[PDB]
Design a protein around this ligand. Structure first.
Ligand SMILES: Nc1nc2c(ncn2[C@@H]2O[C@H](COP(=O)(O)OP(=O)(O)O)[C@@H](O)[C@H]2O)c(=O)[nH]1
Ligand SMILES: [Mg+2]
Ligand code: NA
Length: 170
């Protein structure tokens, strides 16, 4: 009685991958989540009249190999590619995350959303138009989030589900 959607959250250390996932699931902002915990979470939610079971991998620790992450990259249906709007380097890093996904899928048409997180912080070094340019180039949506205030968080995830449906029958 539910449709499963396999989602993968990627991006540089410290951008708020865990914070966004935890906010989606618990409606809580977690100040201090272990940067090393990689794991999958489940969320049941009704999106456009369909009862969805989201199966979400919150990735961590790019440095080392991971059997879980390997399985999710190969079989994941969509990707949230996250940078922080006060972390220029994380924005610059998006290129590499996107290339890695393109390679695993042997494809340039992969359901993905570019997410610019920490929108509540005043120290903004990546402008919305830089992000809009980058997403336009990739042919993907751009959404600004705050895992702290929850602004944009459901939007990011609902939009990814919709991009998955645009790509394949579910
Ligand atoms: N102010 C603010 N801080 C955030 C936001 N998202 C995450 N953080 C903080 O940024 C740091 C890294 O978040 P975390 O989720 O562990 O990042 P991860 O390494 O990508 O999983 C933590 O202190 C979080 O409390 C946000 O939207 N706003
Ligand atoms: Mg994390
Ligand atoms: Na959170």
């Amino acid at each position: 009685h539910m449709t499963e959607y396999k989602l993968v959250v990627v991006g540089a250390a410290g951008v708020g991958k865990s914070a966004l996932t935890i906010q989606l699931i618990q409606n809580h902002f977690v100040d201090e989540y272990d940067p090393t915990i990689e794991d999958s979470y489940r969320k049941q939610v009704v999106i456009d009249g369909e009862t969805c079971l989201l199966d979400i991998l919150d990735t961590a620790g790019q440095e080392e190999y991971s059997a879980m992450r390997d399985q999710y990259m190969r079989t994941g249906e969509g990707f949230l590619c996250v940078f922080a709007i006060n972390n220029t380097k994380s924005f610059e890093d998006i290129h590499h995350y996107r290339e890695q996904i393109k390679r695993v899928k042997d494809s340039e048409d992969v359901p993905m959303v570019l997410v610019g997180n920490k929108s509540d912080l005043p120290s903004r070094t990546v402008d919305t138009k830089q992000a809009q340019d980058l997403a336009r180039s990739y042919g993907i949506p751009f959404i600004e989030t705050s895992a702290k205030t929850r602004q944009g968080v459901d939007d990011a995830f609902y939009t990814l589900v919709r991009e998955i449906r645009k790509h394949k029958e579910k």
